[PDB]
Design a protein around this ligand. Sequence first.
Ligand SMILES: [C][C]([N])[C@]1([O])=O[O@@-]23[C@@]45=[C]C([C])=C([C])[C]=C426N2=[C@@]4(C(=O)[N]C(=O)N=C4N5[C][C]([O])[C]([O])[C]([O])[C]OP([O])(=O)OP([O])(=O)O[C][C]4O[C](N5[C]=NC7=C5N=[C]N=C7[N])[C]([O])[C]4[O])[O-]2136
Ligand SMILES: [C][C]([N])[C@]1([O])=O[O@@-]23[C@@]45=[C]C([C])=C([C])[C]=C426N2=[C@@]4(C(=O)[N]C(=O)N=C4N5[C][C]([O])[C]([O])[C]([O])[C]OP([O])(=O)OP([O])(=O)O[C][C]4O[C](N5[C]=NC7=C5N=[C]N=C7[N])[C]([O])[C]4[O])[O-]2136
Lengths: 363, 363
Amino acid sequence: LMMHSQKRVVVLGSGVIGLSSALILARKGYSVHILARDLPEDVSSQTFASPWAGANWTPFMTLTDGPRQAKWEESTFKKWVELVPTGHAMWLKGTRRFAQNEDGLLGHWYKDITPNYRPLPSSECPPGAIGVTYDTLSVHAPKYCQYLARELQKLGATFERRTVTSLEQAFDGADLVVNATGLGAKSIAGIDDQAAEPIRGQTVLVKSPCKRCTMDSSDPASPAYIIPRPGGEVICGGTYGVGDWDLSVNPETVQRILKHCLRLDPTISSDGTIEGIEVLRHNVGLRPARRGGPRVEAERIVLPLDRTKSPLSLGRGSARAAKEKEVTLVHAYGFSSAGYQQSWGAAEDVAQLVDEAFQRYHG
Amino acid sequence: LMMHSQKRVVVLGSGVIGLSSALILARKGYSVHILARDLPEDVSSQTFASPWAGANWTPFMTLTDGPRQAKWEESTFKKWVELVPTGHAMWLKGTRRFAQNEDGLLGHWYKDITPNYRPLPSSECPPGAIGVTYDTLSVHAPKYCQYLARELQKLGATFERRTVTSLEQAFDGADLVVNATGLGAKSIAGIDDQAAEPIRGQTVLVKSPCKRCTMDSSDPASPAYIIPRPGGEVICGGTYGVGDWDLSVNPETVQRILKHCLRLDPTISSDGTIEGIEVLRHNVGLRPARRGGPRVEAERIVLPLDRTKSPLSLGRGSARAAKEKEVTLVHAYGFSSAGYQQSWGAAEDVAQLVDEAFQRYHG
Ligand SMILES: [C][C]([N])[C@]1([O])=O[O@@-]23[C@@]45=[C]C([C])=C([C])[C]=C426N2=[C@@]4(C(=O)[N]C(=O)N=C4N5[C][C]([O])[C]([O])[C]([O])[C]OP([O])(=O)OP([O])(=O)O[C][C]4O[C](N5[C]=NC7=C5N=[C]N=C7[N])[C]([O])[C]4[O])[O-]2136
Ligand SMILES: [C][C]([N])[C@]1([O])=O[O@@-]23[C@@]45=[C]C([C])=C([C])[C]=C426N2=[C@@]4(C(=O)[N]C(=O)N=C4N5[C][C]([O])[C]([O])[C]([O])[C]OP([O])(=O)OP([O])(=O)O[C][C]4O[C](N5[C]=NC7=C5N=[C]N=C7[N])[C]([O])[C]4[O])[O-]2136
């Protein structure tokens, strides 16, 4: 007769959001099992977003438009500062950010977070653009997820490859699931979220000692960015193809991205020419976005599902029947272009929802 | 000092085409190694087509439009007949095929292949449609690939998971590669085929003892088909979304497919109603098609690649340089909606090209 945990949770999804959420829960003493199709070793899989990110910290919203996003970003910056000594995050000093106009600088809301924030002179911007410079942070996206997974191993979390088609498959050995499935949320019966949408991102991974980050949103016909990452490499971008599921490399996009990034910073090349860029890989990932913004909230659901709950329910629609339990589903998906930079703060909010649900519903 | 093989080949890709090609080569005494991202155990992976097929034998072209396709189909039918005794293929007796008009019956070219071919009376067709009936064959798509893989194991072929980005990575231990990469052919440097395109197919897998196949192309607003497969299950379709990469399940498509299939055959349900259909899974796969039709041909290529051969070449465009060898690349991709029904005949043509290349170029 042993004393077993009364704090079991399943995390569905093993991208940066599921991993971060799992880790804070494990630290809080929950017994965590991670169920996912794609795991941190899957460093070239296009069926999840996390391998493909820069990943730097670049706020995209005003406070009024994105209050949660700012909270989550501010919290994650603090965490990444703590990771610099051990090399899991890296300073991007003197990052340059260009916008079409003052509005695109988002009210400068993050100016107390990124050190050394200040305007750039027009001489330091693309023609007709406006700019600021500051010190930000980046992580090596696949290696950061693998780090989180090692931390999870030590805290007793376990992992299992599974592809779920209906929610009851996740409510396996726990009465609370964290839904961190990115795009998958649309096609799981009992979630069925039609608002989930991809935002396609093509990049070129380059070998370069360049440690300068440049974020250029001043040309609406050509998104571009240069994001150095731990390790001797730079990610050159990019695209933001809303609703585009295409996983193939566009060769014309390659040329546009490299020409534009070269204009922003010639040192990404050996000799300043497109031909001097040492290309390591051409990449395409689908950012998991959501019309109406990221979903971070707790829902109570009755199982089994019926066709009345979900058009995708399995079995005969004719059912209604069977055993019947109520469970808690804590959503955490739709982070779009900002899942890494929001991940720690989002995870903190997920863990708070789990604590509150446990108090109300789980004894 | 042992006598080693002088007949090494790599097959790049492990869908039905790569597997079939590998198997005929192994039978011919080649030493075959299969390199692929997705292998036959990956029965729910959306990054290749082969898990998702019906798979039945339904010619789609006239002889004049598709001479190779007909050759390949006729050969594969003979092979599948040979597989019926051991349960790897199944007769679909009294299959019904509906078309909008006589032209859609393709000149009846296959009437000596499928037993019991004859016209249907209009009373047996959707209103305004024309029809024929015949006996055809189907295989269980994922299990058929797993069968081929067991046959390959016995003949000494080996497998390795790899995702290739540039052709030299495949020319590993062999001077001849079979390129059976489906959609992947567009994004591998040294192949770069912009004509590769997906054709998206959504289906509903249903549990039903129904053994009747119905193929309905008489409604251009609603493709539909019911394909029984070994095992107690039927695949209900479908869609043909040319150029559509969307991997998510469309709930409105579910309703259209089930309503239309029910009109064609009520016995897919327990009680003849949509609600009586026992749904096992909702599926989306991308057929690997190609503008200009399937590509089955042998090319000679110099390695290393340079930026002049491929916009996606790795390293600096500035290169031209390095060791330099010529190798043989035998293409086998772009089979669209007909890769299973063409697979054996296509493999026979691949193996002939390999024999001829070996004679001319490989000693
Ligand atoms: C500049 C920037 N920002 C940009 O560009 O944007 O972006 C990214 C992405 C991409 C694609 C790119 C190209 C880039 C990048 N970069 C970054 C940065 O820098 N930063 C940040 O922050 N971010 C970013 N990004 C974005 C990201 O990536 C995102 O957001 C994330 O990753 C997201 O995450 P999550 O949410 O976690 O998601 P994922 O990863 O996708 O994962 C999912 C999961 O789940 C699973 N599943 C699904 N479904 C299912 C499942 N399982 C089971 N069953 C079912 N059914 C999967 O598998 C996984 O695990 O930028
Ligand atoms: C009625 C009919 N016909 C229709 O509907 O159409 O179709 C299919 C499909 C689908 C999707 C569906 C839904 C259905 C179905 N079905 C069938 C029938 O019935 N019959 C026939 O014949 N067919 C069919 N189908 C179609 C099929 O599926 C196809 O064609 C095939 O599968 C194709 O094959 P292949 O060519 O082999 O391809 P895949 O599978 O995709 O594979 C590929 C491979 O490769 C690899 N990769 C790529 N990339 C790469 C790689 N590796 C390495 N590296 C790189 N980069 C992959 O992974 C694999 O392995 O019907």
